[PDB]
Design a protein around this ligand. Structure first.
Ligand SMILES: C=C(C)[C@H]1CN[C@H](C(=O)O)[C@H]1CC(=O)O
Ligand SMILES: C=C(C)[C@H]1CN[C@H](C(=O)O)[C@H]1CC(=O)O
Lengths: 257, 257
């Protein structure tokens, strides 16, 4: 009855092993799949998981004026709820509603083990080690808009960098870090960073602190009567220990390093 | 024109040195005083700071059925906004609205340096070192309501403990930790814990991780037309670096240890 928009991202939503022999929601597993299930039980709804057609999170296009991604699905009435690692930002909360955060994070640095970098300050003062960001998302927008001297210097480098320091997906950025032999550093959300650190061949690490402090939230379109039940469900789950339990399950219980 | 309810708590709201010769809002300084000022500038309001008469944060009384503290001020229309270290909890969000978190925190352990305790598990398995909580607030409510084995064992000890392990104020709990010579441990929010660690005689420390993950938020009563401007102001300030700058100012720039 209720359409849940989400996206393929490890370990939030992914295909089960042998997903061919499963139907509907049963094809998928992950943190956000479990989260949708808990939320639906508390607010008492039936739901259909739909993967966002364009594979995007949500940005407003400069010329067409149109929102893409999951935000777009909500804005144009194609979906009722988005349950994904969708970062709570000002631009988005202007057109959709977020619940309280179900997970906390910050922008962080991924290096290949042995790269002599300990902070964002280290990266900015040199050119030998290239560094980049996804070309779509809140991390790029953070650097684009920063007045802080260090991040301003980082944005000037990145927008000019040749060849392009921007990657299309998380896997692509992680791939580039691994194959570059200490010569590429990846700026990404600490949640994905921590997850990759736990995955073989265990050649990556998070360095320094987070550059910022934010959260992912469950999104609903403006005026949805599911806004309050959803927000309260999240607080219920958080206080019950369920969010912590879910994090440990998909991040640390499966850890290989 | 707009009434801002808040409370005396270091370093969020406090009296300036020689506050006698100042009038109105100018009597006060602190993190939340600066925060009110930033918010009011963005949403374009004039405001009067009022200290909550009963010195409480906000709980519903078992018999009278009446909310006390800052939550009460909002609920009964005595104030329009609460700007304070007011923890976002399910019970409160049921009767008031919170903005997105302006600060992240978690329940934590304060010990006197040299107390051989490294985790919550350590405290629960022994009786020689007493441990307590404020007798009013979200920390007590967390232990009261936990199904997690370890915290359940901690609550059973605390509610039965003789003499009372509960303190009326933060200063009183910190006082008890300092004067007990390693025999009392204090369960409090990590923000207050971190702040005390930076204050002379530098005899306290935070040990282990946070037991949970939550935030403080700006509160408005249900149906307030200041709800959205406030929420968006917080995201604006957060993304601009102002919340981080404010934290460093009142926690670390002043640090003595
Ligand atoms: C995986 C991606 C592209 C998403 C996830 N959350 C962020 C977002 O919602 O924008 C993006 C990550 C990033 O931008 O670093
Ligand atoms: C200082 C106090 C009593 C407040 C502050 N925030 C929490 C609250 O809003 O309940 C309380 C702390 C705590 O309960 O540990």
């Amino acid at each position: 009855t209720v359409v849940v928009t989400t996206i393929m991202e490890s370990p939030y939503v992914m295909y089960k092993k042998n997903h061919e022999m499963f139907e509907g929601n049963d094809k998928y597993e992950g943190y956000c799949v479990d989260l949708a299930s808990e939320i639906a039980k508390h607010i008492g709804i039936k739901y259909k998981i739909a993967i966002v057609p364009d594979g995007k999170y949500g940005a407003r296009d400069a010329d067409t004026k149109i929102w893409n991604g999951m935000v777009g699905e909500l804005v144009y009435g194609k979906a009722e709820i988005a349950i994904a690692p969708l970062t709570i930002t000002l631009v988005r909360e202007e057109v959709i509603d977020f619940s309280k955060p179900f997970m906390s994070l910050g922008i962080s640095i991924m290096i290949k083990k042995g790269t002599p970098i300990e902070s964002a300050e280290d990266l900015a003062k040199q050119t030998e080690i290239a560094y980049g960001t996804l070309d779509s998302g809140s991390t790029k927008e953070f650097f684009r808009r920063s007045k802080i001297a260090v991040y301003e210097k980082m944005w000037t480098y990145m927008r000019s960098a040749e060849p392009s320091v921007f990657t299309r997906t998380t896997a692509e950025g992680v791939a580039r870090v691994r194959k570059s032999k200490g010569k590429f550093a990846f700026l990404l959300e600490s949640t994905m960073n921590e997850y990759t650190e736990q995955r073989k061949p265990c050649d990556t690490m998070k360095v320094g602190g987070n550059l910022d402090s934010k959260g992912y939230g469950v999104a609903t379109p403006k005026g949805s009567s599911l806004r309050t039940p959803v927000n309260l469900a999240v607080l219920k789950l958080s206080e019950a220990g369920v969010l912590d339990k879910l994090k440990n399950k998909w991040w640390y219980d499966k850890g290989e390093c």
